[PDB]
Design a protein around this nucleic acid. Structure first.
Ligand SMILES: [K+]
Ligand SMILES: [K+]
Ligand SMILES: [Mg+2]
Ligand SMILES: [Mg+2]
Ligand SMILES: [Mg+2]
Ligand SMILES: [Mg+2]
Ligand SMILES: [Mg+2]
Ligand SMILES: [Mg+2]
Ligand SMILES: [Mg+2]
Ligand SMILES: [Mg+2]
Ligand SMILES: [Mg+2]
Ligand SMILES: [Mg+2]
Ligand SMILES: [Mg+2]
Ligand SMILES: [Mg+2]
Ligand SMILES: [Mg+2]
Ligand SMILES: [Mg+2]
Ligand SMILES: [Mg+2]
Ligand SMILES: [Mg+2]
Ligand SMILES: [Mg+2]
Lengths: 191, 118, 137, 86
RNA sequence: AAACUCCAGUUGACACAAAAUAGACUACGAAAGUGGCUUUAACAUAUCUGAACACACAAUAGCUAAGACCCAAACUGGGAUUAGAUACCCCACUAUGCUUAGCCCUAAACCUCAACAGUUAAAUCAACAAAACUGCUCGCCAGAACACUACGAGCCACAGCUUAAAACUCAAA
């Protein structure tokens, strides 16, 4: 995380683009001169933008730093963007039992309702040789439990020289979900 | 039995301090106590700040009242002291001079084996 | 006279003085040395705040706040704001066994303040609130 | 809280030697058991665990005192060999 | 990282919560338990032994009702870790821990040593624990597993407690 707080007296860079407490642009200056300003005016230094090639810092009072920090947290509460997508993964075997596959299927379902990405790998079993098409059946069994709740993010693909298949499942987009409801309703009208 | 009342009074002038003691000794007598002596231990700074009856205290008058009373008088007297606004802290203990100290020959050595064994 | 590590008792007549001020009149540097931070407040004998600095207000974040060099920097910052207000001699009252317990005092000295006494006021309950359960590590 | 301040756990600094004053204060708090007390109080020690450690500490102290006494007693004969060659 | 930002520090006021140091002590009580202060009441038996069920008790957890609520905290929620993490790690908060009145009647309720009396000479004694035994009495045990289970009965207990088998199986345990 990046916090809106006083950077301190030790500034990372040597050349610093500085602004005034009122926003007046003071231009670029050396960090040694900035520390002298912070002491002469009794002000603290915050980092407003780092993307700019010349590092941009602004002088601010403790009261201002508080108001901005309060402002920002009122925006994020109003607009809490879910930034990270978490890639959960399950390595399965071809000879997995039904009780174990039913347990791992329920686990996959809970990951999809949380809007995660589920990478499913299926590997050849111990003492067992299987047709690569048979391994692909498990993917369709897992997804069949989630008819209108999930779909192939990446379709089944052979990996490790064909020894083990791979896949990625995802939650259906809102548009794809309304389409499924529509198609399902049309079938209801037909029947 | 014989009791000892350790009485810490609000720091006051002589007239109000005497009125508090008389009012306190009469409360003992009203409950059947036979008052034996009254000792002044002097006004001093309290070992810590004491809040009593919506006031903060840093000094107090320390007094002792040696008296005999029935066992039922203690409970009633403790209640009386809780309501007197001029009393900072009042405690009734069994008089220490009633308990006779048993004679001691000395420090008998204790075997170390028992220490770890115990 | 021989040196006494025991502080002068208020109300008694001592001969010790610091810039003409008695022990009861020397400002107090309150150092709270926590496990993940160190807070320093300098106050006058009348409880008037004069300077405040912590590892967080000096630009340290997360585990860097819980270091000696962060506390030393917080001490220097509090000393500077206190020296401007006329403070030379201070009584140190430190509560907590954090990493900035001693380093915070060094920073106060490097900042121009003279420590005349050290007091520990680490809270020890005499029986109090139940602490959190032990950690399994 | 209700007591007087700057009496308990207070050490005066001599000749600006703050390091020696801090070591004296830390030695005072250690000898009185406050440092170990503060540390053991960061997390709750359960009563069965406190009894076990208190019992372990009391038996170790006795065992160390008894082992020190034995060596002191048996070090009287550490003098040079009086009958060397025999 | 999340969480908080009417947040933190100093000072003052402030509890129906919990009881540093003493305690390196080894006490009280039938056991369970009992370690801030004061007071009142008060710790059975002038031979011992004597109950799964009689009589009276019995940590923690838990139930029913009404209260208190600092802090801790199952569960739960969030953060992170992970192949997964219904965990360990971080945060929040609840039942609960407290009081009152009723229940429930369990514990590795363990000095893992039944009560009482006696002995230190015999062989000291499988081993380890905790030196080895005698008298006397009650309780209890008779391969493992099934089994702190089934059925019956009793119980304020109703997902419970107490008592407690058999069949099949094994040559061990
Ligand atoms: K206590
Ligand atoms: K045991
Ligand atoms: Mg991953
Ligand atoms: Mg009997
Ligand atoms: Mg019995
Ligand atoms: Mg019987
Ligand atoms: Mg039973
Ligand atoms: Mg019980
Ligand atoms: Mg309860
Ligand atoms: Mg809490
Ligand atoms: Mg979770
Ligand atoms: Mg609660
Ligand atoms: Mg209580
Ligand atoms: Mg026990
Ligand atoms: Mg018996
Ligand atoms: Mg058997
Ligand atoms: Mg059971
Ligand atoms: Mg049963
Ligand atoms: Mg039954």
């Amino acid at each position: 995380k990046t916090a809106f707080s006083n950077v301190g007296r030790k500034i990372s860079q040597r050349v610093i683009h500085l602004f005034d407490e009122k926003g007046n642009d003071l231009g670029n200056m050396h960090r040694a001169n900035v520390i002298r300003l912070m002491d002469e005016r009794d002000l603290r230094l915050v980092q407003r933008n780092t993307s700019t090639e010349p590092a941009e810092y602004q002088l601010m009072t403790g009261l201002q730093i508080l108001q901005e920090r309060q402002r920002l947290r009122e925006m994020e509460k109003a607009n809490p963007k879910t930034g990270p997508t978490l890639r959960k993964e399950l390595i399965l075997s071809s000879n997995i039992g039904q009780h174990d596959l039913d347990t791992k299927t329920k686990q996959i379902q809970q990951w999809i309702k949380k809007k995660h990405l589920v990478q499913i790998t299926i590997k050849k079993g111990k003492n067992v040789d299987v047709s690569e098409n048979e391994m692909e059946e498990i993917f369709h069994q897992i997804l069949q439990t989630m008819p209108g709740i999930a779909t192939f993010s990446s379709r089944p693909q052979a990996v490790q020289g064909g020894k083990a298949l791979m896949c990625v499942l995802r939650a259906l987009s809102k548009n794809e979900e309304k389409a499924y409801k529509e198609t399902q309703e049309t079938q209801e009208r037909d029947t | 039995p014989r009791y000892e009342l350790a009485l810490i009074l609000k720091a006051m002038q002589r007239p109000e301090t005497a009125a508090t003691l008389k009012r306190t000794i009469e409360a003992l007598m009203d409950r059947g106590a036979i008052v034996r002596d009254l000792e002044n231990l002097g006004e001093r700074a309290l070992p810590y700040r004491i809040s009593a009856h919506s006031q903060q205290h840093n000094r107090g008058g320390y007094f002792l009242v040696d008296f005999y009373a029935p066992t039922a008088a203690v409970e009633s007297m403790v209640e009386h002291l809780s309501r007197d606004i001029d009393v900072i802290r009042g405690n009734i203990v069994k008089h220490p001079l009633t308990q006779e100290l048993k004679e001691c020959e000395g420090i008998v050595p204790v075997p170390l084996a028992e220490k770890l064994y115990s | 006279t021989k040196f006494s590590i025991y502080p002068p008792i208020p109300g008694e007549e001592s001969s010790l003085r610091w810039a003409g001020k008695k022990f009861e009149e020397i400002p107090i540097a309150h150092i709270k040395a926590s496990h993940n931070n160190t807070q320093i407040q300098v106050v006058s004998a009348s409880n008037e705040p004069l300077a405040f600095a912590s590892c967080g207000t000096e630009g340290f974040r997360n585990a860097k706040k819980g270091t000696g060099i962060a506390a030393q920097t917080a001490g220097i910052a509090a000393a500077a704001r206190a020296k401007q207000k006329g403070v030379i001699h201070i009584r140190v009252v430190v509560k907590g066994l954090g990493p900035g317990r001693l380093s915070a005092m060094h920073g106060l000295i490097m900042g121009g303040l003279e420590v005349i006494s050290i007091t520990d006021n680490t809270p020890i309950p005499h029986x109090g609130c139940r602490p959190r359960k032990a950690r399994k590590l | 809280a209700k007591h007087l301040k700057f009496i308990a756990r207070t050490v005066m600094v001599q000749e600006g030697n703050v390091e020696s004053a801090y070591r004296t204060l830390n030695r005072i708090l250690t000898m009185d058991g406050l440092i170990e007390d503060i540390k053991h109080r960061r997390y709750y020690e359960k009563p069965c665990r406190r009894r076990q450690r208190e019992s372990y500490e009391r038996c170790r102290r006795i065992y160390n005192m008894e082992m020190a006494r034995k060596i002191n007693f048996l070090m009287r004969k550490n003098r040079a060999d009086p009958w060397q060659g025999c």
